[PDB]
Amino acid sequence: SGAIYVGNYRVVNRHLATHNDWANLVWEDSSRDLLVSSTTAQGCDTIARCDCQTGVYYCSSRRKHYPVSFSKPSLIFVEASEYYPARYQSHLMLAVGHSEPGDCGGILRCQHGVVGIVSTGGNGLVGFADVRDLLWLDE
Ligand SMILES: COc1ccc(C(F)(F)F)cc1CC(=O)N1CCS[C@H](C(N)=O)C1
Ligand SMILES: [Zn+2]
């Protein structure tokens, strides 16, 4: 679990969105595993606007943060869940690191701010859904 809070927005994995998230829907993209909902309280997370390929992510299954090198956002294969079956997920970045399904929602950050959230993983790899391109999160 986990979310990004920026301005009047809440960013979560689409497969983990709640009834409230869907009732206050701003935008969702199944191909990215992202959903953004509106909030009454003001968010203070800074979104990075950069092309960093190094950062630190939070891993709930270990109660630890890990430094990682990660790939550029691209189209990558994702097996089936109760949330999606074999398909290409766009805007995904891979890193060598530990993750378990419950790790989805952990933030990946670089010196510029929030880069994305954990969205997949498997075989010693961790996948992050990028959010740096969503320029509208700040306006
Ligand atoms: C970070 O999640 C992990 C991590 C590891 C494993 C391992 F296979 F090893 F059991 C499994 C998962 C779970 C997973 O990847 N998915 C399920 C939720 S929807 C997600 C997607 N965005 O399509 C795909
Ligand atoms: Zn950066």
Side-chain angles (χ1 to χ4, degrees):
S1 64
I4 307 164
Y5 293 98
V6 46
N8 297 309
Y9 297 127
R10 164 179 144 94
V11 192
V12 281
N13 295 89
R14 192 193 184 272
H15 75 274
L16 297 178
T18 70
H19 295 290
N20 185 61
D21 288 321
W22 276 101
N24 292 296
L25 179 64
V26 171
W27 169 83
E28 51 80 28
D29 190 335
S30 175
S31 77
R32 297 178 65 153
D33 183 43
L34 291 182
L35 183 144
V36 177
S37 59
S38 59
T39 68
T40 54
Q42 163 88 356
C44 291
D45 289 335
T46 286
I47 309 297
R49 301 300 180 194
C50 71
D51 80 345
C52 279
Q53 272 184 258
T54 67
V56 173
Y57 77 108
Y58 181 68
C59 171
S60 64
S61 67
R62 292 285 187 272
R63 277 187 209 130
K64 271 183 162 81
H65 298 256
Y66 291 112
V68 283
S69 295
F70 56 90
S71 68
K72 292 205 171 195
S74 71
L75 276 170
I76 290 144
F77 197 79
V78 184
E79 295 232 4
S81 51
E82 323 72 74
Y83 335 92
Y84 320 83
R87 94 206 197 273
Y88 254 24
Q89 178 164 317
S90 65
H91 299 267
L92 190 56
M93 299 170 295
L94 298 188
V96 173
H98 183 73
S99 70
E100 302 171 32
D103 287 327
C104 284
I107 281 163
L108 172 59
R109 301 180 67 91
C110 64
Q111 60 181 100
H112 306 106
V114 176
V115 175
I117 49 167
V118 179
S119 174
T120 75
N123 299 314
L125 294 152
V126 57
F128 310 94
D130 184 49
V131 301
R132 301 178 282 188
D133 64 315
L134 308 176
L135 311 184
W136 55 269
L137 293 178
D138 289 312
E139 58 218 22

